[PDB]
């Protein structure tokens, strides 16, 4: 009634997403339609959490939740409209980005991510499809379906968080607790995609393949680097892969400065993972940087 549907953007378990027009104001929004009529599936559960979090996360680099409508047997979340995701951008441009666009997107990602962490929210679902891209070059962190607030002492979170290709080694080893460090690993993976052909850095088939592919590139952490590693619930011995494997051929768009940031984001031991705040002060983001 209040919104005219224009065309569907995407559809999954999460719900159907339309481009839409406000009938009153004629402004172009994005509608996520969430069906409530199936009373033995918990899709609403996630939608309500996404609403609680985005109502307290206002920042030009986080998708803006305008309004929530309850009508028919559906929830409708009204989002600002974006041109594409980073997934369709990689497809659009032969996965081959300008080093300044690479630098621009990572910056906007870390601002929106450092904002989340400061507001005590973990995203826990970073991937290109959850990065909304406008034509003017603006990037927004979207999809807080799997996000949760932290601070209250817990036994553990879920280990069944973050899609396999973007999940950090501590979580693959079944870590009970994890901090803001979880999103900083995903940020590293996305950064490597931007800096090559938009292709996933660690595309594993299972948990085992995932940990093998990470240690093969970055090297298997030692007891010096990561003492608690061998005490983690789903820890099993991996080959000692060397720490000498070059990053130059994996991210050939990056100068040594870019590559140094990448290595601070992709430390296996979550405690040593550079934060969003610390990352934004990195030389890679100076106007000095070559």
């Amino acid at each position: 009634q209040k919104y005219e549907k224009l065309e569907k953007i995407g559809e999954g378990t999460y719900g159907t997403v339309f481009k839409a027009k406000n009938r009153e104001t004629h402004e172009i929004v994005a509608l996520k339609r969430v069906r409530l009529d199936d009373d033995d599936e918990g899709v609403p559960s996630s939608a309500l959490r996404e609403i609680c979090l985005l109502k307290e996360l206002k920042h030009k680099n986080i998708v803006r939740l305008h309004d929530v409508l309850h009508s028919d047997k559906k929830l409708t979340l009204v989002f600002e409209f974006c041109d594409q995701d980073l997934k369709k951008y990689f497809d659009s441009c032969n996965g081959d980005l300008d080093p300044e666009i690479v630098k621009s997107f990572l910056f906007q990602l870390l601002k929106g991510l450092g904002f989340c962490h400061s507001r005590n929210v973990l995203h826990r679902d970073l991937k290109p499809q959850n990065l909304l891209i406008n034509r003017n070059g603006e990037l927004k962190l979207a999809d807080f379906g799997l996000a949760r607030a932290f601070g209250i002492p817990v036994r553990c979170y879920s280990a069944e968080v973050v899609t396999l290709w973007y999940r950090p080694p501590d979580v693959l080893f079944g870590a009970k607790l994890y901090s803001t460090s979880i999103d900083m690993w995903s940020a590293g993976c996305i950064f490597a995609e931007l800096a090559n052909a938009g292709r996933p850095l660690f595309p594993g088939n299972d948990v085992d393949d995932q940990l093998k592919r990470i240690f093969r590139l970055l090297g298997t952490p030692t007891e010096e680097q990561w003492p608690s590693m061998t005490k983690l619930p789903d820890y099993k011995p991996y080959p000692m892969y060397p720490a000498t494997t070059s990053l130059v051929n994996v991210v050939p768009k990056l100068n040594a400065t870019g590559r140094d940031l990448l290595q601070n984001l992709l430390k296996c031991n979550p405690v040593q993972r550079i934060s969003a705040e610390e990352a934004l002060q990195h030389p890679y983001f100076s106007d000095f940087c070559p």
Partner: protein
């Protein structure tokens, strides 16, 4: 610091708040909450029970701001308490998703979702603050224990 102990406070809290309900027991809230946690567990919607000290304190934080002094029936009180519970699960629960059936006690489902939206619009800000501010969590933990 025991779950049973903290649930017994919440029930004694609700009975004191809801003056109009003369035939409500401080065990009735406790029975309704435990019953749900069991149902989800035995249906395999979770591995461990949701009802721990921290989450009872969270649920209390909602109830004291959502639950009117003027709730007219035990049935309405249960509908409102379980709406607060459904939101606690969805905000703090370790599972991605939780179903509605255990939490629905109204013939009008429209009413349940309209109420979810109501409580999120009132509480979304303190829902984050109890997690962000340890001082606030302890303030609310204290207040709960002082409800017996």
């Amino acid at each position: 610091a025991s779950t049973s102990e903290l649930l017994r406070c919440l029930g004694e809290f609700l009975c004191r708040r809801c003056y109009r309900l003369k035939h409500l027991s401080p065990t009735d809230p406790v029975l309704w909450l435990r019953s749900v946690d069991r149902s989800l567990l035995l249906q395999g919607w979770q591995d461990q029970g949701f009802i721990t000290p921290a989450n009872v304190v969270f649920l209390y934080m909602l109830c004291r701001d959502v639950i009117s002094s003027e709730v007219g029936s035990d049935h309405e009180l249960q509908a409102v308490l379980l709406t607060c519970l459904y939101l606690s699960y969805s905000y703090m629960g370790n599972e991605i998703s939780y179903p509605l059936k255990p939490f629905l006690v109204e013939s009008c489902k429209e009413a349940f979702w309209d109420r979810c939206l109501s409580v999120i619009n009132l509480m979304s800000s303190k829902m984050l603050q109890i997690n962000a501010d340890p001082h606030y969590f302890t303030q609310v933990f204290s207040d709960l224990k002082n409800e017996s």
